[PDB]
């Protein structure tokens, strides 16, 4: 905080803006920045929209710099604020921090109201996002990697059928090793997921909720992406698959042969993908 204060007091002109991102559960550093900038600045602000809401009251703090005297004045303000943070004190007020706490509790309740909404209301909220005009100053939608592997609902299901046909034929031409087949089937699972979120339009919402549940669960089974018998109805040569491998072995190959664990950030990436899928960023 001393370094930030010295940089801001040397660099910023009069009437300038100092924007600092900060938490609020770190109260000591918050009161210390209040101590270091409040004699320096003429204005104060706290602002935080819904995106910062984790459960710890993150916010921006905006000071407007007035006049600053000289290096004697800089040393005196820094030393006096260090003295005040030493003596368990700050320039922050009581009614100000209680209204601050009220605004944060209202923000947390409203974020819980938005996130726990029904799934058609989730669709209504996702279609009305401000990502269109302001954020697209060169901002690109977070597209999955198979979105760059396509040239062009039910034809997407035909593509998925052809893909799983090719992958099971790769499994057949493998033995005509175990973790390597699991690797190939996990990559197949991941690409089925990416093609599925390509297929997630703003109309079919059951698949939206199911894919969101698969992401939130942590793992993904191929039994959930398409059923065994439903795919074999939608397949091409199911009798060859039943003759060579069979429903027992292919049932082993769908769920437990490709149990794809994710990381945190991979789950984040696919939730961003589902959000873009609802916003109409994959079907044009």
């Amino acid at each position: 905080a001393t370094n930030l204060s010295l940089i801001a007091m040397h660099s910023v002109r009069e009437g300038g803006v100092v924007i600092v991102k900060i938490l609020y559960s770190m109260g000591y550093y918050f009161h210390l920045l209040v101590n270091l900038f409040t004699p320096c600045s003429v204005k104060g602000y706290v602002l935080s929209n819904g995106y910062a809401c984790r459960g710890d009251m993150e916010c921006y703090v905006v000071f407007v710099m007035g006049y600053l005297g000289g290096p004697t004045f800089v040393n005196e303000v820094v030393r006096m604020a260090k003295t005040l943070i030493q003596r368990h004190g700050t320039l922050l007020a009581k009614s100000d921090e209680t209204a601050l706490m009220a605004l944060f509790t209202s923000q947390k309740q409203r974020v819980d109201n938005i996130l726990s909404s029904p799934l058609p209301r989730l669709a209504k909220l996702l279609r009305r996002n401000i990502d269109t005009a302001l954020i697209e100053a060169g901002g690109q939608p977070v597209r999955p990697f198979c979105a760059e592997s396509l040239v062009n609902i039910t034809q997407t299901t035909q593509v998925i059928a052809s893909h799983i046909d090719t992958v099971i034929r790769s499994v057949i031409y493998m033995e005509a090793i175990d973790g390597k087949k699991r690797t190939s089937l996990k990559q197949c699972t991941r690409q089925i997921l990416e093609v599925t979120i390509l297929g997630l339009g703003p109309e079919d919402l059951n698949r939206v909720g199911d894919i969101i549940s698969l992401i939130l669960r942590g793992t993904i089974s191929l039994e959930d992406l398409i059923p065994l018998r439903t795919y074999l109805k939608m397949s091409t040569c199911p009798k060859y698959l039943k003759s060579v491998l069979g429903l027992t072995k292919l049932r082993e190959m769908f769920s437990d042969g490709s149990m794809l664990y994710l990381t945190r950030a991979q789950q984040k990436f696919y939730m961003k993908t589902v959000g873009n899928a609802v916003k109409g960023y994959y079907n044009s």
Partner: protein, 130 residues
């Protein structure tokens, strides 16, 4: 739009001359669908609601610890400044084999301000930035 409305986005002005007293949600990542490198400048979109930030043109613009420059991209779109300064926690061990380049914010390279810089287009206040 509802995440930046009134019961979420507030503008709490601070008390100035007070005396010295002595005292896991993965669902919200559905909204963060723009930006492949960073996803953390929706928070900075609230800063354009402040008029005093937008009334701060004709000067320098110090940016500290971005790492992706998307906040810097947005704000230098909507509030142009003459010379842009840029800082990031950057150890020099991070380089690839046989390469040599310092802190490069990924999305700021893709920004419209930077493409107006390389093409030397004047900004919306009518000057070439740096």
């Amino acid at each position: 739009d509802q995440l930046t409305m009134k019961p979420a986005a507030f503008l709490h002005e601070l008390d100035l001359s007070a005396p010295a007293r002595y005292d896991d949600q993965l669902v919200r990542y559905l909204f963060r669908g723009v930006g492949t490198a960073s996803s953390s400048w929706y928070k900075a979109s609230h800063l354009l609601s402040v008029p005093e930030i937008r009334c701060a043109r004709h000067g320098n613009s110090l940016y500290l610890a971005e790492g992706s420059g998307a906040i810097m991209s947005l704000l230098e779109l909507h509030i142009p400044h003459e010379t842009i300064y840029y800082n990031t926690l950057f150890s020099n061990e991070m380089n690839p084999p046989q390469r040599h380049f310092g802190p490069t914010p990924t999305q700021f390279l893709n920004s419209v301000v930077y493409r107006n810089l390389q093409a030397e287009v004047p900004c919306k206040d009518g000057f070439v930035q740096e």
